[PDB]
Design a protein around this ligand. Structure first.
Ligand SMILES: C[C@H]1CCN1c1nc(-c2cnn(CC(=O)N3CCNCC3)c2)cc(C(F)(F)F)n1
Ligand SMILES: C[C@H]1CCN1c1nc(-c2cnn(CC(=O)N3CCNCC3)c2)cc(C(F)(F)F)n1
Lengths: 298, 304
């Protein structure tokens, strides 16, 4: 535990999954093919992927003590994911969602139950021993609070040898304008196709060109575009692309996004080029889209 | 482990489905492949037999549920919910294959429409051989929700065999519900002292009222039986061997809040009333009152 772990900060959510033949028409009744529970949320799913990739990692997000959280915790621990930094709440419930996964094309429809659960705070983050970590990934959410956490990492970085920087990634996944300030932080910034489209952009290339001016100097902006693979753009101005690796049957895309991000991070943290990390990201996400859940992606 | 002494001839048993219903209230029905925020979510123990055991316990009857569950967090939730309602779950038939049934119910806040993703069918139903191993003496009434009928026929014959050996006051009374319009369930009409048939089933057989359903289906019940058909806001009818069609109007509450489980409230309250020794006409009326009270309340709290 000396700059050896990856940390992801974001949501952990109980995903109550129904696998169906066809997405139900409104006001109809359909019998699902199979049912399961999955530990979800973005940062949490990334830890699943990191752990399967063999990277020691740690999750940090809010949970309320409970049966739900007990299942989540057992799950994390079964994966060897570090929960030591979890910010336990005494107020609110563990969030949960119903996910209907369409077995015929892998589409996933998520009915999210937002609880009270208050977010991980600057002050929570204050308590964290940054020295454990080589890489810290932040799922954009409570921006102002996270901006301070990023400020904290910058701080700790300035006072360390180049050999001992903590690399930082950020994801701006959700269309809300609160998050747009997050583009300014981190060595790697992941911007979702949803965010990109919601800002008027029609492809990864366009989005990268359109938004690069918002990242910080030296940063790599990354934009995955579902079956069209993923693109990246660094300080050299050269657009990089990877085709997708679609499985012959796409059966489950829940967590595809997070699988790509974790795989990109893992690859970069292993010292691979951005081009190689973009391909690996698309490769692992493609493998994942052909399987239910996350086992067997490697 | 463990379980205390249940006095002989004391409990009412309901056999059938328990399911975890996840109910989400939404602004708009979600487009496929989107992520939406529901207005509210709740996890509720559901199922016809399961709902009836809740009502029985609230009415003051010792009651027991028998159905299938598999070990896991779903069953833990359901078992804790049964116990919170005072239901005896010692006869649960624990299974090694399949999932405890779980359903996803999306309610449009606009128009009240229910889209339902129903549980899978991986968990095996209680079988006749599971039933053979149950000591029946602690039960005074056994109610069977019609599901896997050809196995449930043998359970029913096992109860008949028990009853032929008992003195009249240790006979176990039996009821059956046929609530789903499935052909295999039709043979259950011929068993039980009390047979409940649903409006949806009556309508699927082409009957347009409770009167028409009872007169048209009474031929199918065993000699001496009472056939019972509730018809929502039009109240309910019963018909027994004397040929007299009995009726009670509904008792609609001031404002209708929640009709889910109304038909299970009615069922359980008719059984309870009959098991207390009341006449059919009294049970029919008591069933309509409790059910109509229920429809004015969220869930089952406050039904008596
Ligand atoms: C991660 C990317 C980089 C290569 N990855 C990849 N993604 C997907 C995929 C399918 N659906 N989604 C999610 C999505 O589009 N939406 C969800 C949110 N709402 C808007 C629509 C991602 C499929 C494949 C594959 F090609 F393999 F099939 N590969
Ligand atoms: C069970 C029947 C016997 C009296 N019950 C009854 N059902 C319903 C009802 C409405 N929708 N669904 C479905 C059932 C409403 C009422 C009331 F009139 F009271 F609102 N009463």
């Amino acid at each position: 535990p000396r700059g050896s772990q990856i940390l992801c900060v974001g949501l952990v959510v109980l995903d109550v999954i129904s696998l169906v033949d066809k997405y139900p028409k409104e006001d109809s009744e359909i019998r699902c093919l199979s049912q399961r529970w999955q530990r979800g949320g973005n940062a949490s799913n990334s830890c699943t992927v990191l752990s399967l990739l063999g990277a020691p990692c740690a999750f940090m997000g809010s949970m309320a003590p409970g049966h739900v959280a007990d299942f989540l915790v057992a799950d994390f621990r079964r994966r060897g994911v570090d929960v030591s930094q979890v910010a336990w709440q005494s107020k609110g419930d563990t969030p949960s969602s119903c996910c209907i996964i369409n077995n015929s094309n892998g589409n996933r429809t998520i009915v999210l139950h937002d609880t009270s659960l208050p977010d991980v705070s600057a002050t929570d983050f204050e308590k964290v021993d940054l020295t454990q970590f080589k890489w810290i990934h932040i799922e954009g959410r409570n921006a102002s609070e996270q901006v301070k956490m990023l400020q904290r990492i910058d701080a700790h970085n300035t006072r360390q040898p180049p050999e001992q920087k903590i690399r930082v990634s950020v994801e701006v996944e959700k269309p809300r304008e609160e998050l747009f300030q997050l583009f300014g932080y981190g060595d790697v910034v992941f911007v979702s196709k949803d965010v990109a489209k919601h800002l008027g952009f029609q492809s990864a290339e366009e989005a990268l060109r359109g938004l690069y001016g918002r990242v910080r100097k030296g940063a790599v902006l990354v934009c995955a575009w579902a079956e069209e693979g993923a693109d990246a753009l660094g300080p050299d101005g050269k657009l990089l692309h990877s085709d997708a690796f679609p499985p012959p049957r796409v059966v489950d895309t829940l967590g595809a996004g997070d699988t790509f991000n974790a795989s990109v991070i893992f690859s970069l943290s292993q010292g691979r080029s951005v081009q190689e990390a973009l391909r690996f990201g698309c490769q692992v996400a493609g493998k994942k889209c052909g399987l239910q859940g996350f086992d067997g992606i490697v």
